[PDB]
């Protein structure tokens, strides 16, 4: 356990730098796109992604001060539910917006005529509305099931609970296992499998389309595409795989506690996912020449 001190300290500094970078980048992107740039479809997609990331990172200090002493919550019931609702909604919205941006790029590259004749600002806003509705639907179990409970030692741990729902401890355990399994499967499929498949399939088609047409005049587009894909993969696949492994073995973990590496491995993976969320504007918005020109002109 000599090296566990690093495994405990590093997530804190990673979350802190993630908070700083995410707040700075998202504030800059929102200020430039929403006020200093033309209201376009790519502009509103980037603005929605930046708003989701900003609302996620503004919450990050709460998570930092929570996991500083081991996930304890010195705050209260309302603020705890607000924090976790904001985290889950913003994470789902960010991943869904990444998937939607990949789909929009694939549509623009593979079907230029459809993009020219059927990509309008109003329709774009209407179809951005959908991912937010999906995030709300998937955060509904965070809405009702999560609550604040206090251990007899006086420490406050606000997490999911089934005291009211089950009525009897066997029923409580059954419904708790059911909800955890359903939440894990939903996260792995909709939150990870759906966007990762979309990102891999889409961005591969843009790379294939430009390669077939011989439009590659420089290595910049290929480098940007592969950097985005690799960052998203190496930052989300570890966390989602750890969550899936925990959920499939969750019955054993509660009944016998056979697996314990997952408990200490979630934190670095969650830190990596958060750092991906904060770098999303850097690889998604900062890569545009017009955006950087507007940023340097506005300063």
């Amino acid at each position: 356990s000599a090296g566990y001190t690093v495994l405990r300290i590093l997530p804190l500094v990673v979350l802190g730098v993630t908070f700083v970078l995410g707040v700075l980048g998202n504030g800059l992107v929102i200020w430039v796109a929403g006020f200093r740039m033309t209201r376009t479809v790519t502009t509103i997609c980037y603005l929605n992604l930046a708003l989701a990331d900003f609302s996620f990172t503004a919450t990050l200090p709460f998570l930092i001060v929570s996991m500083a002493m081991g996930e304890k919550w010195p705050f209260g019931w309302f603020l705890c539910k607000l924090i976790h609702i904001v985290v889950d909604i913003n994470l789902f919205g960010s991943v869904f917006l990444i998937g939607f941006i990949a789909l929009d790029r694939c549509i623009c590259v593979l079907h230029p005529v459809w993009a020219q004749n059927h990509r309008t600002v109003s329709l774009a806003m209407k179809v951005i509305v959908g991912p937010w509705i999906l995030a709300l639907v998937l955060t509904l179990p965070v809405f009702l099931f999560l609550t604040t409970v206090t251990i007899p030692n006086g420490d406050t741990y606000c997490t999911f609970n089934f005291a009211s729902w089950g009525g009897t401890p066997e029923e409580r355990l059954k419904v708790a296992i059911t909800m955890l399994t359903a939440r894990g499967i939903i996260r792995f499929v909709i939150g990870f499998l759906l966007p990762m498949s979309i990102v891999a399939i889409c961005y591969g088609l843009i790379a294939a389309k430009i390669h077939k047409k011989g439009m590659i005049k420089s290595s910049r587009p290929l480098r940007v595409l592969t950097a985005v894909v690799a960052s998203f993969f190496i930052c989300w696949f570890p966390f989602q795989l750890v969550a899936l492994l925990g959920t499939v073995w969750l019955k054993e973990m509660l009944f016998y506690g056979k697996y314990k590496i997952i408990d200490i491995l979630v934190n670095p993976t969650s830190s990596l996912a958060f750092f991906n969320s904060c770098l999303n504007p850097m690889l998604y918005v900062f890569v545009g020449q017009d955006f950087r020109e507007r940023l340097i002109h506005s300063l």
């Binding site: 976790h84 889950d88 409970v149 609970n161 089934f162 708790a176 969750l250 506690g257 993976t269």
Partner: peptide, 15 residues
């Protein structure tokens, strides 16, 4: 997508 940290400590059924 928010990972539960200490929901395995049987606080899930605590009233």
């Amino acid at each position: 997508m928010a990972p539960r940290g200490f929901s395995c400590l049987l606080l899930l059924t605590s009233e």
